[PDB]
Amino acid sequence: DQRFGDLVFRQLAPNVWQHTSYLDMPGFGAVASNGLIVRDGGRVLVVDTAWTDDQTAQILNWIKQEINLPVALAVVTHAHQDKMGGMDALHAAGIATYANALSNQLAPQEGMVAAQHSLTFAANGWVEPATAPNFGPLKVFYPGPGHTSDNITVGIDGTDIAFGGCLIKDSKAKSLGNLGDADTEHYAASARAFGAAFPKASMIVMSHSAPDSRAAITHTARMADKLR
Amino acid sequence: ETGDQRFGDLVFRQLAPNVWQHTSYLDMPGFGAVASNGLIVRDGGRVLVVDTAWTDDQTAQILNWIKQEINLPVALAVVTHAHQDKMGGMDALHAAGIATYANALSNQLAPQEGMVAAQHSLTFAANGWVEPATAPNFGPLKVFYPGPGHTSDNITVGIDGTDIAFGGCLIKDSKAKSLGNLGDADTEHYAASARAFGAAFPKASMIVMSHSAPDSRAAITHTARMADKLR
Ligand SMILES: O=C(CS)Nc1ccc2ccccc2c1
Ligand SMILES: O=C(CS)Nc1ccc2ccccc2c1
Ligand SMILES: [Zn+2]
Ligand SMILES: [Zn+2]
Ligand SMILES: [Zn+2]
Ligand SMILES: [Zn+2]
Numbered sequence: 001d002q003r004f005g006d007l008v009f010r011q012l013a014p015n016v017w018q019h020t021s022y023l024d025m026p027g028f029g030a031v032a033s034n035g036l037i038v039r040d041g042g043r044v045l046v047v048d049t050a051w052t053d054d055q056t057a058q059i060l061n062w063i064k065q066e067i068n069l070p071v072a073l074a075v076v077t078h079a080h081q082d083k084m085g086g087m088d089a090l091h092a093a094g095i096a097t098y099a100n101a102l103s104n105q106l107a108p109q110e111g112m113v114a115a116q117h118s119l120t121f122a123a124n125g126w127v128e129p130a131t132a133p134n135f136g137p138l139k140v141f142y143p144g145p146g147h148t149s150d151n152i153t154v155g156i157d158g159t160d161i162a163f164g165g166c167l168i169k170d171s172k173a174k175s176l177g178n179l180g181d182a183d184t185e186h187y188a189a190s191a192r193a194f195g196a197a198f199p200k201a202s203m204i205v206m207s208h209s210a211p212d213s214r215a216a217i218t219h220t221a222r223m224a225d226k227l228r
Numbered sequence: 229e230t231g232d233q234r235f236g237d238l239v240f241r242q243l244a245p246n247v248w249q250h251t252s253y254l255d256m257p258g259f260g261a262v263a264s265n266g267l268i269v270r271d272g273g274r275v276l277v278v279d280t281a282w283t284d285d286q287t288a289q290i291l292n293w294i295k296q297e298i299n300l301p302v303a304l305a306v307v308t309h310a311h312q313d314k315m316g317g318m319d320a321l322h323a324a325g326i327a328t329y330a331n332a333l334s335n336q337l338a339p340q341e342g343m344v345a346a347q348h349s350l351t352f353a354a355n356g357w358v359e360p361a362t363a364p365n366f367g368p369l370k371v372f373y374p375g376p377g378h379t380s381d382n383i384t385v386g387i388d389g390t391d392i393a394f395g396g397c398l399i400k401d402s403k404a405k406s407l408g409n410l411g412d413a414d415t416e417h418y419a420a421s422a423r424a425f426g427a428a429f430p431k432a433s434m435i436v437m438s439h440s441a442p443d444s445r446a447a448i449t450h451t452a453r454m455a456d457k458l459r
Contacts, residue, residue, distance in 0.1 A: 105354050105373075105375060106375065118354045121332055122349065123335035123349045125336060128351070145380040149380035149414055183412045184411035185410065185411035227411070
């Protein structure tokens with residue numbers, strides 16, 4: 001764990017790091033959110049902002065210091081503040097941003113800045129390549145509604161890593177923290193679909209837990225089974 | 229009502245010179261017959277369908293009524309989410325040679341829901357309007373994804389050249405007491421999605437919906453106000 005400003009960075013693989021940012025909430029301090037940073041040849045790719053613009057600027061600052069390669073694009077995994085709260089820092093820096101079309105449609109209602117480009121998905125959940133050109137190792141998959149209607153996931157090609165975002169919680173989790181915008185009928189199938197889409201991922205990275213094994217997927221699905 | 233026609237178990241009501249509502253019924257134990265409405269649109273030399281009936285056999289009845297009453301080929305159908313009242317009859321559409329379209333997400337959910345997927349997937353811009361390249365030759369059908377509400381995948385359809393907009397199961401009429409939301413509803417965004425449908429078709433004065441007879445725009449307002457209370 002490397003501290004840099006108020007953020008934490010953890011190398012997960014030779015070309016992959018987890019970024020972690022924290023926000024005090026009423027009655028619960030320092031709520032963590034994780035995203036990813038990926039080195040792809042001569043460029044860097046980001047998955048998710050931090051909670052705030054200032055924190056997301058610090059992600060860019062850490063990249064400059066520790067990797068020193070331009071950030072070519074970012075993908076954000078749904079329209080909540082932990083994932084899209086720092087869009088302005090990316091746009092200020094000229095970084096192209098991508099999100100599920102539905103995330104961009106929800107953004108204004110959620111008080112988020114929309115990404116500059118929209119991803120669309122085939123009926124099997126895989127991103128349409130016309131909408132995700134030149135994504136390098138980021139393999140984007142829409143698993144179905146679960147945590148939200150718009151949640152998307154990202155496999156990191158060539159590594160053991162798949163990012164479930166806020167859809168997956170770790171195997172020690174006690175609840176899904178599902179809310180009005182969760183789809184409790186389909187959550188379990190969407191969680192299993194993420195697992196089936198990245199069948200050889202052995203390190204599951206998540207927004208609100210430290211990385212876990214594939215048991216995080218199964219444990220999350222089994223919790224969701226009870227919500228139907 | 230005077231003017232409604234019957235073919236088998238189906239009821240048809242003409243709403244405008246080139247638009248009819250189709251109504252089919254499914255018996256639900258303890259409650260009885262539940263109506264579901266869709267649309268039939270005559271577009272020059274062809275017919276376009278919005279939504280199947282609850283079953284394959286009921287959907288075949290729609291197509292046979294079209295042949296008898298309109299006698300133009302059915303070019304395509306749009307279906308408005310992956311529930312049985314809207315997609316229960318996909319096999320019948322396919323057997324009749326009708327090209328079918330649904331939200332990509334509807335096609336992704338269809339297998340989990342016991343439904344057959346449409347042959348083609350519609351995708352949507354960030355402003356909700358369908359991407360034209362996914363909706364070829366749709367004529368007067370203007371397809372709009374208003375956001376999550378009744379389900380994550382619910383879509384809506386305005387009929388150009390008419391005063392009609394179809395809210396499917398997202399919109400209930402101005403006399404409705406509840407929304408009937410289940411685990412797949414998005415109760416946080418439902419209200420804004422209903423209002424977005426109204427804003428997408430701001431001149432429509434006849435609102436058609438799946439589970440109420442046609443209403444004024446009060447159906448949109450009342451639906452959104454009911455949804456406000458679920459947040
Ligand atoms: O995590 C997300 C988006 S997935 N949002 C929040 C919002 C408020 C919270 C309050 C206390 C603890 C965690 C919280 C997490
Ligand atoms: O099954 C669907 C799919 S949207 N819709 C309805 C609509 C109204 C109903 C009323 C009583 C019982 C079941 C009902 C089911
Ligand atoms: Zn979230
Ligand atoms: Zn989150
Ligand atoms: Zn429905
Ligand atoms: Zn319905």
